[PDB]
Every structure is written in structure tokens, then in C-alpha cells.
Amino acid sequence: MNIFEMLRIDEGLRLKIYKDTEGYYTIGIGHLLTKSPSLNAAKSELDKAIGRNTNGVITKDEAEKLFNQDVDAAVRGILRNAKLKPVYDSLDAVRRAAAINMVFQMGETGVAGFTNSLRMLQQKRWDEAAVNLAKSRWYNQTPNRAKRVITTFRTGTWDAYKNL
């Protein structure tokens, strides 16, 4: 298991434009295209991302290319964020994957507002951190995914993904 396999499980793989859990146009392995309700706007974002006129369909190779870029972007975002970087640096590699997963899903700003959870994570108060993380819109809207990510933070193991 690693961050790529982890996010592949959590996000799935779809080669045609679809709507994510929030109703936003998305493609590949959870590549958000736009929050706009316009399909044409989403197709435009897709073409710009891929570098060709796609009309809403991409290949597996293309989906994986965007995925790699997105994972890179999430890590880079954590490292450039004053609130997130110290907490991330404080973590072991397994829990770092859980951190990247969160940022991948909700963005740097969204995660950076988990102030109390972040403190508990840096303190290595794993059970307390886990309890706090679940007190969120995030957990309520995507409980099964959040539960996996939280278990990863709580245990520092891949137990929540090992079977799937």
C-alpha cells in the first residue's frame, strides 16, 4: 500500500466526465474539473488539462498522468502551507499518506481549518485526534472514506485498506 493505491481505492477510476460526491464535474481518479454546473465549462477544463480536444473522454494513461500531478500538487500544497507543513513533517510516512489523502479531497484551505485535529496529530494523541476528525462535515458527508483515513491516522497502519 502507498498514497497512489490508497487514493485509487478512495477515488475510483472513471474515464468519462462524472459528478463527484458534491455534484461537481470530475474525471479520472478524482480529478476535479470545475465547480461550475456547466458541462461545457468542465469539458473546457478537461481539454486544457490534457492538452487536446477530448470531448469528455480520456484514456487510462491520461487519467494516471493527471492523478500523478494531483498527488504532487497536494504534497506541494501541504509543504507551502504554514499550518500544515509542521504537522506533516511531524508524522511518519503512513500518516503522511492520510494527510495527503485529506488535502487531495478537500484542498489545502479546508484541511488547514482542522486546527484542533492538527494540534492533536502533532501531539501524537491518536485516539483524541481520531475523535476530533470525525466531528466534521467531511465525516458526515463521506463517512466510509473518512473512517478509512481516520483509522490510518489513529493506527499508523494500512489496516483500513489492506483488504480492499
Output the smallest distance, CB 54 to Cl ion, in A.
9
Instruction: Tell me the residue ranges of DSSP E strands in 20-101.
Output: 25-28, 31-32
d(CA 107, CA 2): 20
SS3 for 15? strand
Among 7, 17, 66, 102, binds Cl ion (CB under 5 A): 17
Asked whether 22 and 65 are in contact (CB, 8 A), the reply is no
Spot the catalytic one: 5, 10, 11, 45: 11
Residue type, 63: A
User: In this structure, are residues 83 and 114 in contact, taking their beta carbons and an 8 Å threshold?
Assistant: no
Binding-site size, Cl ion (CB under 5 A)? 2
Active site residue 11: yes
The nearest distance, CB 105 to Cl ion, in angstroms, is 23
44 is in an annotated binding site: no
Q: Is 56 an interacting residue with respect to Cl ion (CB under 5 A)?
A: yes
Q: What mask of x and - would describe binding to Cl ion in positions 119 to 158, judged by CB under 5 A?
A: ----------------------------------------
Q: Which of the ranges 15-23, 25-33, 64-72, 142-150 carries the binding residues for Cl ion, by CB under 5 A?
A: 15-23
- Report how far residue 43's alpha carbon sits from residue 41's, in angstroms, rounded to the nearest whole number: 5
C-alpha cell recorded at residue 115? 486546527
By CB under 5 A, tell whether 111 contacts Cl ion: no
20 included as an active-site residue: yes
The span from the CA of 24 to the CA of 69, in Å, is 19
Catalytic residue among 5, 10, 20, 128: 20
Question: What dihedral angle (degrees, nearest 10) is formed by the CA atoms of 31, 67, 11, 147?
Answer: -110
Binding residues for substrate: 32, 104, 117, 132
Give the footprint of Cl ion on this chain (CB under 5 A): 17, 56
Q: Which residues are catalytic?
A: 11, 20
